[PDB]
Coordinates of C-alpha atoms (C1' of nucleotides) and ligand atoms in Angstrom, one line a residue:
Chain A
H1 CA -88.5 27.0 -126.7
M2 CA -85.8 24.7 -128.4
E3 CA -83.0 26.0 -126.7
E4 CA -85.2 25.4 -123.5
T5 CA -86.0 21.9 -124.3
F6 CA -82.5 20.7 -125.0
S7 CA -80.3 22.7 -122.5
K8 CA -78.9 20.6 -119.8
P9 CA -76.6 22.4 -117.5
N10 CA -74.3 20.6 -115.2
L11 CA -75.8 20.3 -111.6
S12 CA -74.1 21.8 -108.6
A13 CA -73.1 19.2 -105.9
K14 CA -76.1 20.0 -103.9
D15 CA -78.6 19.7 -107.1
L16 CA -76.9 16.5 -108.0
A17 CA -77.3 14.9 -104.4
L18 CA -80.9 16.2 -104.1
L19 CA -81.5 14.2 -107.6
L20 CA -79.9 11.0 -106.4
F21 CA -81.8 10.9 -103.2
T22 CA -85.1 10.9 -105.1
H23 CA -84.1 7.3 -106.3
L24 CA -83.0 6.2 -103.2
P25 CA -85.3 4.4 -100.4
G26 CA -85.5 5.8 -96.8
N27 CA -83.4 9.0 -95.3
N28 CA -80.3 9.4 -93.8
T29 CA -79.0 5.8 -94.8
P30 CA -75.4 5.3 -95.6
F31 CA -76.1 5.6 -99.3
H32 CA -77.6 9.3 -98.4
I33 CA -74.0 10.2 -97.1
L34 CA -72.3 8.4 -100.0
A35 CA -74.4 10.6 -102.6
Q36 CA -73.8 13.7 -100.9
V37 CA -69.8 12.5 -100.6
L38 CA -69.6 11.5 -104.0
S39 CA -71.5 14.5 -105.8
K40 CA -69.1 16.8 -104.1
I41 CA -66.2 15.2 -105.5
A42 CA -67.6 14.7 -108.8
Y43 CA -68.3 18.5 -109.0
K44 CA -64.9 19.6 -107.8
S45 CA -63.5 17.2 -110.4
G46 CA -65.2 19.1 -113.1
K47 CA -67.2 15.7 -113.7
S48 CA -70.8 16.7 -112.5
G49 CA -72.2 15.4 -116.0
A50 CA -70.1 12.8 -116.8
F51 CA -71.1 11.4 -113.1
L52 CA -74.9 12.0 -113.2
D53 CA -74.8 10.2 -116.8
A54 CA -72.9 7.1 -115.7
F55 CA -75.6 6.9 -112.8
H56 CA -78.5 6.9 -115.3
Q57 CA -76.5 4.4 -117.4
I58 CA -76.1 1.9 -114.6
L59 CA -79.8 2.4 -113.8
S60 CA -80.7 1.7 -117.4
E61 CA -79.3 -1.6 -117.2
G62 CA -81.8 -2.6 -114.8
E63 CA -79.7 -2.0 -111.3
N64 CA -81.2 0.2 -108.6
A65 CA -79.5 3.3 -107.3
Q66 CA -78.0 1.8 -104.4
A67 CA -76.0 -0.9 -106.7
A68 CA -75.3 2.2 -108.9
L69 CA -73.8 4.4 -106.3
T70 CA -71.6 1.5 -104.9
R71 CA -70.6 0.7 -108.4
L72 CA -69.6 4.2 -109.1
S73 CA -67.6 4.4 -106.0
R74 CA -65.8 1.3 -107.5
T75 CA -65.2 2.5 -110.8
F76 CA -65.8 6.0 -112.0
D77 CA -62.3 7.6 -112.3
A78 CA -63.0 10.6 -110.3
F79 CA -63.3 8.4 -107.2
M80 CA -60.3 6.2 -107.8
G81 CA -57.6 6.4 -104.9
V82 CA -59.7 9.3 -103.3
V83 CA -60.0 9.4 -99.5
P84 CA -63.0 10.0 -97.7
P85 CA -63.4 13.2 -96.2
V86 CA -63.3 13.7 -92.4
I87 CA -66.4 15.1 -90.7
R88 CA -66.5 16.6 -87.0
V89 CA -69.1 15.2 -84.9
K90 CA -69.7 16.0 -81.0
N91 CA -69.9 12.6 -80.4
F92 CA -70.8 9.6 -82.4
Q93 CA -74.5 9.6 -80.9
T94 CA -74.8 12.5 -83.5
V95 CA -73.9 10.3 -86.8
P96 CA -77.7 9.6 -88.3
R97 CA -79.1 6.7 -86.6
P98 CA -79.7 4.4 -90.0
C99 CA -75.5 5.0 -90.2
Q100 CA -74.7 4.0 -86.7
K101 CA -74.2 0.3 -86.9
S102 CA -72.0 0.5 -90.2
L103 CA -69.4 2.4 -88.1
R104 CA -66.4 0.9 -88.0
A105 CA -62.6 1.6 -86.7
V106 CA -60.9 3.8 -89.4
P107 CA -58.4 1.3 -91.2
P108 CA -54.8 2.6 -92.0
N109 CA -55.3 3.5 -95.6
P110 CA -59.3 4.0 -96.2
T111 CA -60.5 5.0 -99.7
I112 CA -63.8 5.8 -101.5
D113 CA -63.1 3.0 -104.0
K114 CA -63.3 0.1 -101.4
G115 CA -66.6 1.3 -99.9
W116 CA -65.5 4.0 -97.2
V117 CA -67.9 6.8 -97.1
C118 CA -66.6 9.0 -94.6
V119 CA -64.9 9.2 -91.5
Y120 CA -66.3 10.9 -88.5
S121 CA -64.0 12.4 -85.6
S122 CA -65.4 13.5 -82.1
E123 CA -64.2 16.1 -80.1
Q124 CA -62.2 13.7 -78.2
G125 CA -60.2 13.1 -81.4
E126 CA -61.6 9.3 -81.5
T127 CA -62.8 8.5 -85.1
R128 CA -65.0 5.9 -86.9
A129 CA -65.0 5.2 -90.6
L130 CA -68.5 4.6 -92.5
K131 CA -68.5 1.5 -94.2
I132 CA -71.1 0.4 -97.1
Chain B
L1 CA -112.1 -15.5 -115.2
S2 CA -111.7 -12.0 -115.4
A3 CA -109.0 -9.7 -114.6
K4 CA -110.9 -8.2 -111.4
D5 CA -112.4 -11.6 -110.4
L6 CA -108.6 -13.0 -110.5
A7 CA -107.3 -9.8 -108.1
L8 CA -109.9 -10.4 -105.6
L9 CA -109.2 -14.0 -104.9
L10 CA -105.3 -12.8 -104.5
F11 CA -106.6 -10.4 -102.1
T12 CA -107.9 -12.9 -99.9
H13 CA -104.2 -14.5 -99.4
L14 CA -102.7 -10.9 -98.5
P15 CA -102.1 -9.3 -95.2
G16 CA -103.6 -5.8 -94.8
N17 CA -105.1 -3.7 -97.5
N18 CA -104.0 -1.5 -100.2
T19 CA -100.3 -2.5 -99.8
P20 CA -97.7 -2.6 -102.7
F21 CA -98.5 -6.2 -103.0
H22 CA -102.6 -5.4 -103.4
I23 CA -101.5 -3.2 -106.4
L24 CA -99.0 -6.1 -107.5
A25 CA -101.7 -8.4 -107.8
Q26 CA -104.2 -6.1 -109.6
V27 CA -101.2 -5.2 -112.1
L28 CA -100.5 -8.9 -112.6
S29 CA -103.8 -9.9 -113.0
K30 CA -104.8 -7.5 -115.6
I31 CA -101.7 -8.3 -117.7
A32 CA -102.2 -12.1 -117.0
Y33 CA -105.8 -11.8 -118.3
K34 CA -104.6 -9.8 -121.4
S35 CA -101.9 -12.5 -122.4
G36 CA -105.1 -15.2 -122.1
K37 CA -102.7 -16.7 -119.2
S38 CA -105.3 -16.0 -116.5
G39 CA -106.0 -19.4 -115.8
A40 CA -102.4 -20.6 -115.8
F41 CA -101.4 -17.6 -113.5
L42 CA -103.7 -18.6 -110.8
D43 CA -102.8 -22.3 -111.0
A44 CA -99.2 -21.3 -110.8
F45 CA -100.0 -19.3 -107.6
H46 CA -101.8 -21.8 -106.1
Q47 CA -98.9 -24.4 -106.8
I48 CA -96.4 -22.4 -105.1
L49 CA -98.6 -21.8 -101.9
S50 CA -98.8 -25.7 -101.8
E51 CA -95.0 -25.8 -101.2
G52 CA -94.8 -23.7 -98.2
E53 CA -94.4 -20.5 -99.3
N54 CA -96.9 -17.3 -98.7
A55 CA -98.6 -15.0 -101.1
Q56 CA -96.2 -12.4 -101.0
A57 CA -93.4 -14.8 -102.0
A58 CA -95.6 -16.4 -104.7
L59 CA -96.3 -12.9 -106.4
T60 CA -92.6 -11.7 -106.2
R61 CA -91.9 -15.3 -107.6
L62 CA -94.4 -14.9 -110.3
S63 CA -93.5 -11.8 -111.4
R64 CA -89.9 -12.8 -112.0
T65 CA -90.4 -16.3 -113.5
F66 CA -94.2 -16.4 -115.0
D67 CA -94.1 -16.2 -118.9
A68 CA -96.6 -13.2 -119.2
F69 CA -94.6 -11.0 -116.9
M70 CA -91.2 -11.3 -118.3
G71 CA -89.5 -7.9 -119.4
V72 CA -93.2 -6.2 -119.0
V73 CA -92.9 -2.4 -118.2
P74 CA -95.1 -1.3 -115.3
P75 CA -98.4 0.2 -116.2
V76 CA -99.0 4.2 -115.5
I77 CA -101.8 5.0 -113.2
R78 CA -103.0 8.4 -113.0
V79 CA -103.4 10.0 -109.7
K80 CA -104.4 13.3 -108.3
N81 CA -101.5 14.0 -106.4
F82 CA -98.8 11.6 -104.7
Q83 CA -100.6 11.8 -101.2
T84 CA -103.7 10.3 -102.8
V85 CA -101.6 7.1 -103.5
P86 CA -102.9 4.5 -101.1
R87 CA -101.4 5.0 -98.0
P88 CA -99.4 1.9 -97.2
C89 CA -97.8 2.5 -100.6
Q90 CA -96.5 5.9 -100.1
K91 CA -93.2 5.2 -98.6
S92 CA -92.5 2.6 -101.7
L93 CA -92.5 5.5 -104.0
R94 CA -89.1 6.4 -105.9
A95 CA -88.1 8.4 -109.0
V96 CA -89.0 6.4 -112.1
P97 CA -85.6 4.7 -113.6
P98 CA -85.2 4.6 -117.2
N99 CA -86.3 1.0 -117.6
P100 CA -88.4 -0.2 -115.2
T101 CA -89.8 -3.8 -115.5
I102 CA -92.5 -5.8 -113.4
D103 CA -89.9 -8.8 -113.1
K104 CA -87.3 -6.3 -110.8
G105 CA -90.2 -5.2 -108.5
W106 CA -91.6 -2.2 -110.3
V107 CA -95.3 -2.4 -109.9
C108 CA -96.5 0.7 -111.4
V109 CA -95.7 4.5 -112.4
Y110 CA -97.9 7.0 -110.8
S111 CA -98.5 10.3 -112.5
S112 CA -99.7 13.6 -111.1
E113 CA -101.9 16.1 -112.3
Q114 CA -98.6 18.2 -112.7
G115 CA -97.2 15.5 -115.1
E116 CA -94.9 14.4 -112.4
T117 CA -94.3 10.6 -111.7
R118 CA -93.1 8.0 -109.1
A119 CA -92.6 4.3 -109.5
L120 CA -94.0 1.9 -106.9
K121 CA -91.3 -0.5 -105.6
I122 CA -91.4 -3.9 -103.9
Chain C
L1 CA -50.5 -7.5 -75.7
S2 CA -52.8 -10.3 -74.2
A3 CA -55.2 -12.6 -76.1
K4 CA -58.0 -10.9 -74.7
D5 CA -56.7 -7.4 -75.5
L6 CA -55.6 -8.2 -79.2
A7 CA -59.4 -9.8 -79.6
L8 CA -61.0 -6.5 -78.3
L9 CA -59.1 -4.3 -80.8
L10 CA -59.9 -7.0 -83.6
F11 CA -63.3 -6.7 -82.7
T12 CA -63.6 -2.8 -83.4
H13 CA -62.9 -3.4 -86.8
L14 CA -65.8 -6.2 -87.4
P15 CA -69.3 -5.9 -88.4
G16 CA -72.0 -7.2 -85.9
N17 CA -71.5 -9.1 -82.5
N18 CA -70.9 -12.9 -82.0
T19 CA -70.3 -13.8 -85.7
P20 CA -68.1 -16.6 -86.7
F21 CA -65.5 -13.8 -87.8
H22 CA -65.8 -12.7 -83.9
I23 CA -65.1 -16.5 -82.7
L24 CA -62.3 -16.7 -85.3
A25 CA -60.5 -13.3 -83.8
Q26 CA -60.9 -14.7 -80.5
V27 CA -59.3 -18.0 -81.6
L28 CA -56.4 -16.5 -83.8
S29 CA -55.7 -13.9 -80.9
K30 CA -55.1 -17.2 -78.5
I31 CA -53.1 -19.3 -81.0
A32 CA -50.9 -16.2 -82.0
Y33 CA -50.2 -15.2 -78.4
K34 CA -49.5 -18.8 -77.3
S35 CA -46.9 -18.8 -80.2
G36 CA -45.1 -15.8 -79.1
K37 CA -46.3 -14.2 -81.9
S38 CA -48.9 -11.7 -80.8
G39 CA -46.9 -8.5 -82.1
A40 CA -46.3 -10.1 -85.6
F41 CA -49.8 -11.1 -85.7
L42 CA -51.1 -7.8 -85.3
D43 CA -48.5 -6.1 -87.7
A44 CA -49.5 -8.4 -90.1
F45 CA -53.2 -7.8 -89.6
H46 CA -52.6 -4.1 -90.2
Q47 CA -50.2 -4.6 -93.0
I48 CA -53.2 -6.4 -95.0
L49 CA -55.8 -3.8 -93.9
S50 CA -53.3 -1.1 -95.1
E51 CA -53.3 -3.0 -98.6
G52 CA -57.0 -2.1 -98.7
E53 CA -58.4 -5.5 -97.7
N54 CA -61.2 -5.3 -94.9
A55 CA -60.9 -7.1 -91.3
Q56 CA -63.0 -10.3 -92.5
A57 CA -60.6 -10.8 -95.4
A58 CA -57.7 -10.0 -93.1
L59 CA -58.7 -12.7 -90.7
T60 CA -59.2 -15.4 -93.2
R61 CA -56.3 -14.5 -95.1
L62 CA -54.1 -14.7 -91.8
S63 CA -55.6 -18.1 -91.1
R64 CA -54.6 -19.5 -94.5
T65 CA -50.9 -17.9 -94.5
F66 CA -49.7 -17.0 -91.0
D67 CA -47.0 -19.6 -90.2
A68 CA -48.2 -20.0 -86.5
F69 CA -51.5 -21.3 -87.7
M70 CA -51.0 -24.0 -90.5
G71 CA -51.9 -27.2 -89.6
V72 CA -53.4 -26.2 -86.1
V73 CA -56.3 -28.0 -85.1
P74 CA -59.2 -26.1 -84.0
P75 CA -59.9 -25.8 -80.3
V76 CA -62.5 -27.8 -78.6
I77 CA -65.1 -25.7 -76.9
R78 CA -67.5 -27.1 -74.3
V79 CA -71.2 -26.4 -74.6
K80 CA -74.3 -27.5 -73.1
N81 CA -75.9 -28.1 -76.8
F82 CA -75.8 -26.8 -80.0
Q83 CA -78.6 -24.5 -79.2
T84 CA -76.2 -22.6 -77.0
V85 CA -73.7 -21.7 -79.9
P86 CA -74.0 -18.1 -80.3
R87 CA -77.2 -17.4 -82.7
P88 CA -75.1 -15.7 -85.6
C89 CA -72.9 -18.8 -85.8
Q90 CA -75.4 -21.6 -85.7
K91 CA -76.0 -21.6 -89.2
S92 CA -72.3 -22.3 -89.9
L93 CA -71.7 -25.5 -88.0
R94 CA -71.0 -28.8 -89.8
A95 CA -70.3 -32.4 -89.2
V96 CA -66.6 -32.4 -88.1
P97 CA -64.7 -33.4 -90.9
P98 CA -61.7 -36.0 -90.6
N99 CA -58.2 -33.8 -89.9
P100 CA -60.0 -30.3 -89.3
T101 CA -57.5 -27.5 -89.4
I102 CA -57.6 -23.5 -88.9
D103 CA -55.9 -22.9 -92.1
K104 CA -59.1 -24.6 -94.2
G105 CA -61.6 -22.1 -92.5
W106 CA -62.3 -24.4 -89.4
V107 CA -62.5 -22.0 -86.4
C108 CA -63.5 -24.2 -83.3
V109 CA -65.2 -27.6 -82.5
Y110 CA -67.9 -27.6 -80.1
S111 CA -68.6 -30.5 -77.9
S112 CA -72.2 -31.1 -76.4
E113 CA -72.7 -32.5 -72.9
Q114 CA -74.1 -35.5 -74.8
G115 CA -70.7 -36.0 -76.4
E116 CA -71.6 -34.8 -79.9
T117 CA -69.4 -32.7 -82.1
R118 CA -70.0 -29.8 -84.8
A119 CA -67.3 -27.8 -86.2
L120 CA -67.6 -23.8 -87.0
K121 CA -66.7 -23.3 -90.8
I122 CA -66.1 -20.1 -92.3
Chain D
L1 CA -75.3 -48.6 -96.0
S2 CA -78.6 -47.8 -97.8
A3 CA -78.8 -45.3 -100.3
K4 CA -81.1 -42.9 -98.0
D5 CA -78.7 -43.3 -94.9
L6 CA -75.6 -42.7 -97.1
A7 CA -77.4 -39.4 -98.7
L8 CA -78.4 -38.7 -94.8
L9 CA -74.4 -38.8 -93.8
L10 CA -73.6 -36.8 -96.6
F11 CA -76.0 -34.1 -96.0
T12 CA -74.6 -33.3 -92.5
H13 CA -71.4 -32.2 -94.3
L14 CA -73.2 -29.7 -96.6
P15 CA -74.3 -26.2 -96.3
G16 CA -77.6 -25.2 -96.8
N17 CA -80.7 -27.5 -97.9
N18 CA -82.0 -28.4 -101.3
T19 CA -79.0 -27.3 -103.1
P20 CA -78.0 -28.6 -106.1
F21 CA -75.2 -30.4 -104.1
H22 CA -77.9 -32.3 -102.0
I23 CA -79.6 -33.3 -105.1
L24 CA -76.1 -34.9 -106.3
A25 CA -75.6 -36.1 -102.9
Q26 CA -78.9 -38.4 -103.3
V27 CA -78.2 -39.0 -107.0
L28 CA -74.9 -40.3 -106.3
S29 CA -75.7 -42.4 -103.3
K30 CA -78.3 -44.4 -105.2
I31 CA -76.0 -45.0 -108.3
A32 CA -73.2 -46.3 -105.8
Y33 CA -75.9 -48.3 -103.6
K34 CA -77.2 -50.1 -106.7
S35 CA -73.8 -50.9 -108.0
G36 CA -72.9 -52.7 -104.7
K37 CA -70.3 -49.5 -104.3
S38 CA -71.9 -47.8 -101.1
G39 CA -69.2 -49.0 -98.8
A40 CA -66.4 -48.0 -101.2
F41 CA -68.1 -44.7 -102.0
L42 CA -68.5 -43.5 -98.8
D43 CA -64.7 -44.2 -97.8
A44 CA -63.3 -42.3 -100.8
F45 CA -65.7 -39.3 -99.6
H46 CA -63.9 -39.6 -96.3
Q47 CA -60.6 -40.0 -98.0
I48 CA -61.0 -36.6 -99.8
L49 CA -62.5 -34.6 -96.7
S50 CA -59.4 -36.1 -94.6
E51 CA -57.3 -34.5 -97.3
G52 CA -58.7 -31.0 -96.1
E53 CA -61.1 -31.0 -99.3
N54 CA -64.6 -29.4 -98.6
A55 CA -67.8 -31.8 -99.0
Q56 CA -68.7 -30.1 -102.3
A57 CA -65.6 -30.6 -103.6
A58 CA -65.4 -34.1 -102.7
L59 CA -69.0 -34.9 -104.5
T60 CA -67.6 -33.0 -107.6
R61 CA -64.5 -34.7 -107.6
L62 CA -66.0 -38.3 -107.1
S63 CA -68.8 -37.5 -109.6
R64 CA -65.8 -37.2 -112.2
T65 CA -63.5 -40.1 -110.7
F66 CA -65.3 -42.8 -109.2
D67 CA -66.1 -45.7 -111.5
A68 CA -69.5 -46.5 -110.5
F69 CA -70.5 -42.9 -111.8
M70 CA -68.3 -43.1 -115.1
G71 CA -70.4 -42.5 -118.3
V72 CA -73.7 -42.8 -116.1
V73 CA -76.9 -41.0 -117.5
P74 CA -78.2 -38.4 -114.9
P75 CA -81.4 -39.8 -113.6
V76 CA -85.0 -38.7 -115.1
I77 CA -86.9 -36.9 -112.3
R78 CA -90.5 -36.4 -113.5
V79 CA -91.9 -33.0 -112.0
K80 CA -95.4 -30.9 -112.7
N81 CA -93.0 -28.2 -113.9
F82 CA -89.9 -26.3 -113.3
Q83 CA -91.6 -24.4 -110.3
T84 CA -91.6 -27.6 -108.7
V85 CA -87.7 -27.5 -108.8
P86 CA -86.2 -26.9 -105.6
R87 CA -85.6 -23.1 -105.5
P88 CA -82.0 -23.3 -104.7
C89 CA -81.6 -25.3 -107.9
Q90 CA -83.6 -23.1 -110.2
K91 CA -81.0 -21.1 -111.5
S92 CA -78.8 -24.1 -112.2
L93 CA -81.2 -25.8 -114.9
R94 CA -80.0 -25.7 -118.5
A95 CA -81.1 -27.0 -121.5
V96 CA -80.1 -30.9 -121.7
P97 CA -76.9 -31.6 -123.9
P98 CA -76.5 -33.8 -126.2
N99 CA -75.5 -37.2 -123.9
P100 CA -75.5 -36.0 -120.6
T101 CA -73.2 -37.9 -118.0
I102 CA -72.8 -37.7 -114.1
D103 CA -68.9 -37.4 -114.8
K104 CA -69.7 -34.3 -116.9
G105 CA -71.3 -32.6 -114.0
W106 CA -75.1 -33.1 -115.2
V107 CA -76.8 -34.2 -111.7
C108 CA -80.3 -35.1 -113.2
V109 CA -82.9 -34.5 -115.8
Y110 CA -86.2 -32.8 -114.9
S111 CA -89.1 -33.8 -117.2
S112 CA -92.0 -31.5 -116.9
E113 CA -95.7 -32.8 -117.4
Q114 CA -96.0 -31.0 -120.4
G115 CA -93.0 -32.9 -122.0
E116 CA -90.1 -30.4 -121.7
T117 CA -86.5 -31.0 -120.1
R118 CA -84.3 -29.3 -118.1
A119 CA -81.0 -30.7 -116.7
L120 CA -79.4 -29.8 -113.6
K121 CA -75.6 -28.7 -113.7
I122 CA -73.2 -28.0 -111.2
Chain E
rA1 C1' -90.9 -1.4 -79.8
rG2 C1' -91.1 -6.8 -81.1
rA3 C1' -92.5 -10.9 -84.1
rC4 C1' -93.1 -12.6 -89.0
rA5 C1' -92.6 -11.5 -94.2
rG6 C1' -90.9 -9.2 -98.7
rC7 C1' -87.0 -6.1 -101.2
rA8 C1' -82.0 -4.2 -101.3
rU9 C1' -76.8 -3.5 -100.5
rA10 C1' -71.8 -5.0 -98.5
rU11 C1' -68.6 -8.6 -97.2
rG12 C1' -66.6 -13.8 -96.2
rC13 C1' -66.4 -18.7 -97.9
rU14 C1' -67.7 -22.4 -101.5
rG15 C1' -68.5 -24.5 -106.5
rU16 C1' -69.0 -24.2 -111.9
rC17 C1' -67.6 -22.6 -116.7
rU18 C1' -64.8 -19.1 -120.3
Chain F
rA1 C1' -59.3 -12.5 -114.6
rG2 C1' -64.5 -12.6 -115.8
rA3 C1' -69.1 -14.5 -115.9
rC4 C1' -72.8 -17.2 -113.1
rA5 C1' -74.3 -20.2 -109.0
rG6 C1' -74.6 -21.9 -103.5
rC7 C1' -74.3 -21.1 -98.6
rA8 C1' -73.5 -17.5 -94.1
rU9 C1' -72.9 -12.9 -91.7
rA10 C1' -73.7 -7.9 -91.6
rU11 C1' -76.7 -3.5 -92.8
rG12 C1' -80.9 -0.9 -94.7
rC13 C1' -85.7 -0.4 -96.8
rU14 C1' -91.2 -1.8 -97.1
rG15 C1' -95.5 -4.3 -95.2
rU16 C1' -98.5 -6.9 -91.9
rC17 C1' -99.8 -8.6 -87.1
rU18 C1' -98.8 -8.1 -81.8
Ligands
CL1 CL1 -105.4 5.8 -115.3
CL2 CL1 -83.0 -37.2 -105.8
CL3 CL1 -82.7 -52.7 -103.3
CL4 CL1 -85.1 -48.0 -107.3
MG5 MG1 -69.8 18.7 -76.5
MG6 MG1 -106.1 -8.2 -97.3
MG7 MG1 -74.3 -4.4 -85.3
MG8 MG1 -79.0 -26.4 -83.3
MG9 MG1 -76.8 -28.1 -94.3
MG10 MG1 -85.0 -2.0 -104.3
MG11 MG1 -63.8 -19.8 -108.6
MG12 MG1 -63.4 -24.7 -117.5
MG13 MG1 -62.5 -22.8 -123.1
MG14 MG1 -87.1 -3.0 -90.9
MG15 MG1 -91.7 -1.7 -92.0

RNA sequence: AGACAGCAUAUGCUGUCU
RNA sequence: AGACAGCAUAUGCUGUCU
C-alpha cells in the first residue's frame, strides 16, 4: 500500500488538462483553451510533472487558477518563445462562444509568453489569434 | 447575540435564498461569534451599509478586512453528494486549492460521502 | 492607404469597440496621412507589434515617438453634449489642460454646443 | 478663491473620485487658502500643467516645492474607524512616521474614535 | 435576453517607494 | 528593474431582479 500511497506518475497532456479544468470557473473559456495548449507543450517537453508542481506552487501562494496559468505562460521555461498552435476551423463562428470576443488579428510574431493562446485558421485562409 | 441570530439578520439584507452570500453570512457569523467579535461584526456590517454600499459588498469587504476573518481557513461542511449543495451555490464550486482562506473568497469546503471535496468560491 | 482604411486595419488589432484606443487610432491615422507618412506609420506600427508589444502599447508608443505627432494639438471634435461622447470614452474625459498635445496622451478635444470643452486622455 | 472652489477646480483635472489625490487636493487648497496663497497656488498648478505634466504630478510636485506647504504637519482628520476612510485611499494608509510633513508625501493623519492613527501616504 | 450586483483576468495610462 | 497604489478599457465567471 505504501507504494500506492506515495507513487505519483506524470500525467498525460489530456489528464493534465482535465485536472486544470477542475480549478477553472465556467466552460470553454479562453483559460480552458490555454490549459489544453500549455498541457500539450509541457507534456511533449518532458515537463508534465514540473508544470503541475509549478501550477500548485502558485495556487499555494493564494492566487487562483486563472492567475496561475497566465503566470506560467509568462515564466515557465518550456513556454518561452514557443509559438501558439494553429487550429483549423470551418469559420470563426465555430470558435467556442466564450472565446469569440477575445479574437484579434494575428500579430506578426505571436508567442505563448505574450498571452497568445492559439491561432484559428478558417476554410478561406483567414486567421484570428486568441488573446488573454 | 448568537451565531444563528446574527446570520438571519444578515439574510434580511441579501437577495434570493441559499446563494453563496447566504453561506458566507453563515460562515462569517459563526467565526465572529466564536472570536467574541459578534457585536463588533454586526456594527461593522451596518456601518458599511450606511456608506451606500450593499450587503454583498459589505460581506466581501468584511471578509477581507475584518480582524476575526483575516487568515482564517474555510470550514469543511459534509454533504451527501455535490448535487445536494444548495442549487444557487453549485456553479461556484471548484477544486480545493492548497491554502484557501476566507479573505480571498473561499467560503467553505464541501466534502462528499466519497470523501471528495469542492470549495465554494465568491 | 487612406486615413479611413488605415483606421479599419488598426481596428482589427483592438479589443472592444469605440474605446479611447479606437478614437486614437482614427486621430493618428488622419494626422499620419496628412503628413504624407501613412506608409511609414503603418510600418512602424507593425514593427512594434513584431517586437511583442500589443496594439494598444504600439499606439501609445507611436503617439510618444512618431515624429509627425510630436507637439501636435489634439483635433477639436464637435458634440451636442458630453453625454454624446461614446460610452467607453466618457470616463476618460478631463478638463482641457493648457497646451494639450497628442504626445502626452491627449487624443482629442470635445467641444459641446454650449461651448464647453473636455479633453480625452489615454 | 475659497478653499472649496479651489479644490473643485482641481478635481476637474483628476481621474476617479475620492482618490488619495482628491484628499491631497483638498488638503493643499485649505493650507494655501489659510496662508493667503490660493492665487499663487492655482497659478503654480496651471504653470506645471502648461509644461505637459498631468494633475497628479503637479500636486505631488507642489506638495514638495511650494513654500506654503514646506514642513507643514498633515491635518488630523477624525473618523469613526478606518473603514470610514474612502475605499480608494484605504490601501495607502501606513503607520504615522516620526514627524510627518506635507512635503514628504504625507497627506493627512486619520485618528479613529478608539485613539488609533494611520497616515495617508502618496 | 436585459438590468443591477459581487468576483476574476488581461491591457493601457498615472503616481509612490526600493 | 521590482514592489506597491490609483484610474480606465476589455473579457470571463457567479448571483438576483425583470
Ligand atoms: Cl458537517
Ligand atoms: Cl480633506
Ligand atoms: Cl476664512
Ligand atoms: Cl477652518
Ligand atoms: Mg464549410
Ligand atoms: Mg434573502
Ligand atoms: Mg468585444
Ligand atoms: Mg457626460
Ligand atoms: Mg474625476
Ligand atoms: Mg476567482
Ligand atoms: Mg513608476
Ligand atoms: Mg525613491
Ligand atoms: Mg534607497
Ligand atoms: Mg455575466
Ligand atoms: Mg449570472
